[PDB]
Design a binder for this molecule. Structure first.
Ligand SMILES: CCCCCCCCCCCCCCCCCC(=O)OC[C@H](COP(=O)([O-])OCC[N+](C)(C)C)OC(=O)CCCCCCCCCCCCCCCCC
Ligand SMILES: CCCCCCCCCCCCCCCCCC(=O)OC[C@H](COP(=O)(O)OCCN)OC(=O)CCCCCCCCCCCCCCCCC
Ligand SMILES: CCCCCCCCCCCCCCCCCC(=O)OC[C@H](COP(=O)(O)OCCN)OC(=O)CCCCCCCCCCCCCCCCC
Ligand SMILES: CCCCCCCCCCCCCCCCCC(=O)OC[C@H](COP(=O)(O)OCCN)OC(=O)CCCCCCCCCCCCCCCCC
Ligand SMILES: CCCCCCCCCCCCCCCCCC(=O)OC[C@H](COP(=O)(O)OCCN)OC(=O)CCCCCCCCCCCCCCCCC
Ligand SMILES: CCCCCCCCCCCCCCCCCC(=O)OC[C@H](COP(=O)(O)OCCN)OC(=O)CCCCCCCCCCCCCCCCC
Ligand SMILES: CCCCCCCCCCCCO[C@@H]1O[C@H](CO)[C@@H](O[C@H]2O[C@H](CO)[C@@H](O)[C@H](O)[C@H]2O)[C@H](O)[C@H]1O
Ligand SMILES: N=C(N)NC(=N)NCCc1ccc(I)c(Cl)c1
Ligand code: SF4
Ligand code: SF4
Ligand code: SF4
Lengths: 154, 386, 45, 313, 93, 176
């Protein structure tokens, strides 16, 4: 029982982190470096992170750019339509905490006011390599999960 | 009926999110209502609380595919109100990196234009080239995109030794890369079926709707601000302006591909004609002195201290200054009240007028022709929304 | 010391191509049809 | 022993489909100057397994269909019919040697569209039903040319038995006498299976705002159809010589041809933009169909005027 | 007997995989044109039912008659296409 | 000077007409495109094996911030607040007072790394090379709060990365 649950989490954690299908909100600048992560030099697809997905087939949402008050409701709705398990990666200063528009009347001061965030990737923009480091950091975070061990001990 | 085009493609794309409210009858588009503002960040109001140096990085983040070109427009506007002149080596560097930036923009414009239509392979081939040009940005500035390199007075730093040879190496092979792109698209009957006679705009309608750049030249209008109203050293380089004949998406696509070839032609002259000398105006009341001077000379330290706190004061006045940005005429209406912070800074984004013409250009076209028409205008909602 | 600055080499850089180069390949339309029909006829026989 | 025979057909199909996803990603990766999967397992060999497990333990959309009875029927019909199209394929010996095998596959393939419709009704959305009617209208249109092209080729074979296509091509592939039909046949299968440059459901879905396990089953059905089309194309146009004593020699050559044909859908997807919906309809009703009708006329007359009429047996 | 057992296995596995995956009236504004595509398909499909016997019809002694009627049927198929074409039944604007 | 991108008149001699007819019927221009993607399949990909391989950077690269020391170990920062004044994002917060030895030093030095635009203006404004943007770019965190650096974090970054920061400064200070 205890042994099986440990190896079973190992399996599903391996599957979910080895097949991370992202939905990217290309909101602004940071989406350019996001495209460079899909470009041949880094080739995010080689890690199992597919190129195109669809909101309803996605595992991770990458908020790549500034989130304005006008866009906030639409971003929350996409997050609400994602099937679980779902993760959010906050990419760049704007999505992290408002960044260079932090004091603007029309900017959400961090996307973590709208959705829960798993990883914060600093930079303006973070380099494509910095984003890839954050994506591989999220895989390690998933590798640490213990859904069945916790469930079995309820 | 009534539709709403999605915010963006399912594949990764960097140009912003659009809310397009569409009227259709059958397959035909009856009305397009672009609802923008989804990336409006109040840049112009923020600039009013910044000194003239502090506001420069805001311009990298407008048309955030043409970073240094946006910097150059702002720098020219400030240099004009200051009544100073950047040194000749800085002007050559600014034209050199202006054309490198034009390559960056046109690769993004053309290959994402194909990527949205479904021709996705050229995107991957050509962003390996963009990756190498990001290395040029990072080597002069330390940043791959938002360099903040071009500044009123010249450029922040001089080219590192060995940079020009590497730029030559890249430029040597680039025309072949354009040739491979054309092999996939230029004569492809599917690409032509998606672009030829799509989004036709007449020369007179283009002018009255406020278009600029390729949106004018695709209709046969013989206008290029680098030729007619030259800035920096553009009057010392030789290049041809591509002109279209049918005013449609296919002719504008060819113009952008030919403009890429002319940019390589211009870069070749900048590499050969780069003169020696200083990189920022030798005027420590505008451009900060060298760090070695700041640490030895009393005058230099005072001017360093004041330039990095209060900033330089700009004589009162207002200018509208524009350049031939990769996306069309990019201008700034900059108002000075005599202090060290701008009083007003309106940004003229070429895509603002272009997206206002989408309703006109899409009349009597199919739902999928709207995809191609926003593609041919090359819209970045960072500059449309400010 | 002599000023040392990123400069082009003496005599300048070599030539850089830019003009479109799509080489002409293939047979004439007559040759292509003739080959296509020849293949058909051989297959028919 | 017949149950065992059924299993060594069904299970190898699903494994072949699972690893076609890997091969497609890597072939497209290298054509795009990158690599594609190469971390999850050596050379990405465990990527299909990781994807499969991920999709099945993924929470369902919780959509609330308008017809539970027919929400479930759609994927069952899609995957059940896809597996059924394999039982008359001579590789070199069919699982079931059907006298009217070609009609059987033509008849079963005509039922595939029911799953597209039934998902649209089960969608419970105006936009998803409109999309389902566009996919159906495209699929049935390109069934017209496939049926006529198929018939024109059978006039040189003389039978509806699939094994007869092997005999018909003992001395020569049928691609020689009928390469004009082979071209339109190949493109019709791309359009029929809704593959790029005809992938309109994937594209127009990517436009209109509004329009995991169940996704996986639908996906496997579509990709098992891609492999079967290319196997049928090889049997139809690139017939492999069959040696009764060395039957596995036929299987090896036949499998290589099927893989190369399957890899060519990947090749084509990497190379071209997407047609516009009205443009792929003009391709069939105004280009392929007029030429297919004229070549159907030609191929009825051709055996008669050359005295090359094949036997019934 | 063998075919039914093959058919049962294919669809029984499809149901088995589906259950694991899941647990363990007015006028649509859709156009007239799309209706006429379906009806065009049906009529062409019906004329294709008549051409299917052709691979057996070619063994007949009465070839002159067979060939005349085979081409006659296909030509009417061509004329049906030509009529929809010229009556703008194939246009999508 | 200008040129026409699409002003060619097709030749209407039967040979040229037949050439265009062959292109339409035999898809030759589509075959040509397939050759180009085929040629890429056999090319070496541009992908690098991250994290075992890394993208090339230069000494000027603007990465994670750090506060620097003199060789004696004394802090370089003298609380002049020029970096706080120039920061385009108002990402720096400084407080200072006389140290117990009378030295002019900071008591608060915060950088909100989620406000920062990584522009490098602070390290240009600094008169003593106290604040720099280091070469580190692999410092993403799991919480927002971990990106609000205080003086202890920034001093630790300086002690952590000084070996490389000093070398990068040595390689670029003559361009500044
Ligand atoms: C049914 C068949 C399922 C087979 C299980 C597949 C697991 C594959 C695997 O774990 O690869 C080794 C993996 C590879 O290690 P990795 O995925 O953590 O990292 C490999 C090294 N990098 C990331 C740097 C490239 O080993 C493990 O991590 C342990 C996971 C065990 C899960 C298996 C449970 C059984
Ligand atoms: C896939 C392999 C591609 C090889 C590389 C490209 C190539 O060699 O073909 C290009 C050739 C030239 O054709 P093109 O440039 O379009 O000029 C007009 C036509 N003379 O164009 C061709 O020669 C195409 C020949 C196509 C042959 C007909 C195809 C029949 C299909 C049935 C099999
Ligand atoms: C709403 C959800 C519905 C989901 C359910 C599943 C969908 C339907 C599945 C498809 C049904 C296919 C049934 C028809 C296939 C029959 C093929 C056939 O013709 O027979 C093949 C074989 C013998 O070879 P044969 O072709 O008959 O030789 C002919 C000589 N001229 O064998 C035979 O001839 C004998 C077979 C006769 C019994 C077949 C009965 C079919 C009943 C289907 C229900
Ligand atoms: C132009 C672009 C094309 C795009 C569409 C993709 C077309 C791909 C075509 C795939 C088929 C290529 C042929 C593959 C050859 C397979 C090699 C093999 O193992 O078989 C050898 C075979 C000769 O033997 P065989 O086929 O039995 O001929 C006897 C006549 N019945 O063959 C000897 O060579
Ligand atoms: C070796 C012996 C022979 C040697 C000498 C050569 C003789 C044979 C060649 C000459 C025969 C006449 C050829 C004339 C064909 C062109 C007719 C024409 O000009 O109309 C085409 C045009 C279609 O244009 P489209 O854009 O597609 O839609 C309508 C808007 N124009 O406008 C139209 O609307 C056309 C509408 C009519 C469509 C006709 C459909 C054809 C019938 C389909 C079956 C094909 C033929 C039988 C099988
Ligand atoms: C001796 C007497 C003998 C009598 C008989 C003689 C016969 C003479 C006739 C010979 C020529 C017949 C050619 C038949 C091939 C089909 C031709 C065709 O339909 O192409 C035209 C079609 C339309 O293209 P478009 O540019 O829009 O033309 C304008 C139309 N209004 O264009 C298209 O189809 C576009 C297709 C786009 C998608 C293609 C992407 C893949 C391309 C590579 C596939 C290669 C095929 C591989 C075959 C594999 C087979 C196993
Ligand atoms: C190829 C066959 C492989 C079979 C392997 C069998 C292993 C079985 C272990 C299943 C573990 C699933 O783990 C669980 O899955 C469901 C959806 O799938 C997720 O989703 C669920 O949890 C969230 C919150 O936790 C709920 O709000 C949600 O309604 C629910 O769907 C859980 O977040 C995840 O913890
Ligand atoms: N990114 C995409 N949606 N396309 C794609 N290549 N999907 C492949 C995902 C998949 C689906 C079912 C199975 I069974 C397996 Cl093994 C893998
Ligand atoms: S964090 Fe920087 S690069 Fe990213 S969207 Fe904001 S300003 Fe642009
Ligand atoms: S890099 Fe720029 S935004 Fe960041 S702290 Fe320094 S001056 Fe402020
Ligand atoms: S870091 Fe430099 S500029 Fe900032 S307060 Fe300290 S000494 Fe002054």
């Amino acid at each position: 029982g205890e042994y099986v649950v440990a190896k079973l989490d190992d399996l599903i954690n391996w599957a979910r982190r080895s097949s991370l299908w992202p939905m990217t909100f290309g909101l602004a600048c940071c989406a350019v470096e996001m495209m460079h992560m899909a470009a041949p030099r880094y080739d995010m697809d080689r890690f199992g992170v597919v190129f195109r997905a669809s909101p309803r087939q996605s595992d991770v949402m990458i908020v790549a750019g500034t989130l304005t008050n006008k866009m906030a409701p639409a971003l929350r709705k996409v997050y609400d339509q994602m099937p679980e398990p779902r993760y959010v990666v906050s990419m760049g200063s704007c999505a992290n905490g408002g960044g260079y528009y932090h004091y603007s009347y029309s900017v959400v001061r961090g996307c973590d006011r709208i959705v829960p965030v798993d990883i914060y990737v600093p930079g303006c923009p973070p380099t494509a390599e910095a984003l890839l480091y954050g994506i591989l950091q999220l895989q390690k975070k998933i590798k640490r999960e213990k859904r069945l061990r916790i469930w079995y001990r309820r | 009926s009534n539709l709403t085009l999605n915010f963006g493609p399912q594949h990764p794309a960097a140009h912003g999110v659009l809310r397009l409210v569409m009227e259709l009858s059958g397959e035909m588009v009856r009305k397009c209502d672009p609802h923008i503002g989804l990336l409006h960040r109040g840049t112009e109001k923020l600039i009013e609380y910044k000194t003239y140096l502090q506001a420069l990085p805001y311009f990298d983040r407008l048309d955030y595919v043409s970073m240094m070109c946006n910097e150059q427009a702002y720098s020219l506007a400030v240099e004009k109100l200051l009544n100073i002149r950047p040194p000749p080596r800085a002007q050559w560097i600014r034209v050199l990196f202006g054309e490198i930036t034009r390559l960056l923009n046109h690769i993004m414009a053309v290959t994402t234009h194909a990527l949205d239509i479904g021709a996705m392979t050229p995107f991957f081939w050509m962003f390996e080239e963009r990756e190498k040009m990001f290395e040029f940005y990072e080597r002069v500035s330390g940043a791959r995109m938002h360099a903040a390199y071009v500044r009123p007075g010249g450029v922040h730093q001089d080219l590192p030794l060995g940079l020009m040879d590497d730029i030559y190496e890249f430029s040597k092979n680039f025309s072949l890369r354009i040739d491979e792109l054309e092999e996939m698209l230029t004569n492809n009957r599917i690409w032509r079926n998606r672009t030829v006679d799509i989004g036709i705009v007449t020369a007179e309608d283009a002018l009255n709707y406020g278009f600029s750049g390729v949106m004018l030249r695709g209709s046969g209008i013989q206008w290029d601000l680098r030729k007619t109203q030259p800035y920096d050293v553009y009057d010392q380089v030789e290049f041809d302006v591509p002109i279209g004949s049918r005013g449609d998406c296919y002719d504008r696509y060819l113009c952008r591909v030919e403009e890429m070839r002319q940019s390589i032609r211009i870069i070749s002259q900048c590499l050969n004609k780069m003169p020696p000398g200083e990189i920022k105006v030798d005027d420590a009341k505008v451009s900060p002195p060298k760090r070695a001077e700041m640490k030895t000379s009393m005058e230099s330290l005072i001017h360093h201290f004041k330039l990095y706190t209060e900033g330089y004061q700009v004589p009162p006045g207002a200018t509208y200054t524009a350049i031939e940005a990769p996306k069309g005429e990019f201008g700034v209406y900059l108002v000075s009240d005599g202090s060290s912070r701008p009083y007003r800074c309106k940004i003229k984004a070429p895509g603002f007028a272009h997206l206002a013409g989408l309703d006109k250009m899409s009349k009597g076209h199919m739902l999928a022709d709207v995809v191609a028409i926003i593609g041919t205008q090359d819209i970045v909602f960072g500059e449309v929304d400010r | 010391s002599k000023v040392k600055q990123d400069m082009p080499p003496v005599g300048g850089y070599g030539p850089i191509d830019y003009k479109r180069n799509l080489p002409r390949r293939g047979l004439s339309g007559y040759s292509m049809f003739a080959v296509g029909i020849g293949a058909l006829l051989f297959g028919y026989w | 022993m017949f149950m065992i025979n059924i299993l060594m057909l069904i299970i190898p199909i699903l494994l072949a489909v699972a690893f076609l996803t890997l091969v497609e990603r890597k072939v497209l990766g290298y054509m795009q100057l990158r690599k594609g999967p190469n971390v999850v397992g050596p050379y990405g060999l465990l990527q299909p397994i990781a994807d499969a497990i991920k999709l099945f333990i993924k929470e369902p959309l919780r959509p609330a269909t308008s017809s539970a009875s027919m929400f479930i029927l759609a994927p069952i019909m899609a995957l059940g019919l896809a597996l059924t199209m394999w039982i008359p394929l001579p590789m070199p010996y069919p699982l079931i040697n059907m006298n009217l095998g070609v009609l059987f596959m033509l008849a079963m393939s005509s039922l595939a569209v029911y799953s597209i419709l039934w998902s649209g009704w089960a969608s419970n959305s105006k936009y998803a039903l409109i999309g389902a009617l566009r996919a159906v209208a495209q699929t049935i249109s390109y069934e017209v040319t496939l049926a006529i092209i198929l018939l024109s080729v059978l006039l040189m074979s003389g039978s509806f038995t699939l094994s007869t296509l092997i005999t018909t091509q003992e001395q020569m592939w049928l691609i020689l006498p009928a390469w004009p039909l082979a071209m339109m046949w190949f493109i019709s299968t791309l359009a029929e299976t809704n593959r790029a440059p005809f992938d309109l459901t994937e594209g127009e879905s990517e436009l209109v705002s509004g329009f995991a396990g169940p996704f996986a089953l639908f996906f496997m059905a579509e990709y098992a159809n891609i492999i079967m089309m290319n196997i049928f194309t090889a049997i139809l146009f690139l017939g492999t010589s069959h040696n009764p004593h060395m039957p596995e020699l036929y299987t090896i050559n036949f499998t290589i041809k099927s893989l190369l044909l399957t890899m060519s859908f990947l090749w084509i997807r990497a190379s071209y933009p997407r047609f516009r919906y009205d443009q792929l309809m003009h391709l069939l009703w105004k280009n392929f169909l007029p030429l297919t009708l004229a070549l159907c006329m030609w191929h009825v007359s051709l055996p008669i005027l050359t005295s090359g009429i094949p036997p019934q047996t | 007997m063998n075919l039914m057992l093959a058919l049962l296995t294919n669809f029984t596995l499809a149901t088995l995989l589906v259950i694991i995956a899941f647990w363990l009236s007015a006028r649509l504004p859709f156009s007239m044109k799309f209706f006429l595509v379906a009806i065009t398909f049906l009529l062409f499909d019906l004329e294709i039912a008549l051409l299917l016997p052709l691979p057996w019809a070619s063994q007949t002694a009465n070839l002159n008659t067979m060939l005349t009627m085979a081409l006659f049927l296909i030509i009417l198929l061509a004329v049906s296409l030509a009529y929809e074409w010229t009556q703008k039944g194939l246009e999508w604007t | 000077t200008y040129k026409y991108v699409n002003l060619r008149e097709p030749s209407m001699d039967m040979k040229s007409v037949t050439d265009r007819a062959a292109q339409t019927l035999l898809w030759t221009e589509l075959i040509r495109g397939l050759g180009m993607t085929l040629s890429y399949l056999f090319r070496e990909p541009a992908t690098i094996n991250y994290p075992f391989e890394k993208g090339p950077l230069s000494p000027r690269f603007r990465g994670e911030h750090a506060l620097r020391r003199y060789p004696s170990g004394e802090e370089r920062c003298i609380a002049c607040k020029l970096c706080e004044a120039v920061c385009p994002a108002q990402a720096i917060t400084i407080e200072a007072e006389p140290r117990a030895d009378g030295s002019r030093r900071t008591t608060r030095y915060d950088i909100d790394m989620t406000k920062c635009i990584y522009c490098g203006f602070c390290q240009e404004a600094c008169p003593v090379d106290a604040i720099v943007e280091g070469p580190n770019f692999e410092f993403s965190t799991e919480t927002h709060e971990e990106l609000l650096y205080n003086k202890e974090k920034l001093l630790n970054n300086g002690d952590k990365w000084e070996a490389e920061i000093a070398a990068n400064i040595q390689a670029d200070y003559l361009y500044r």
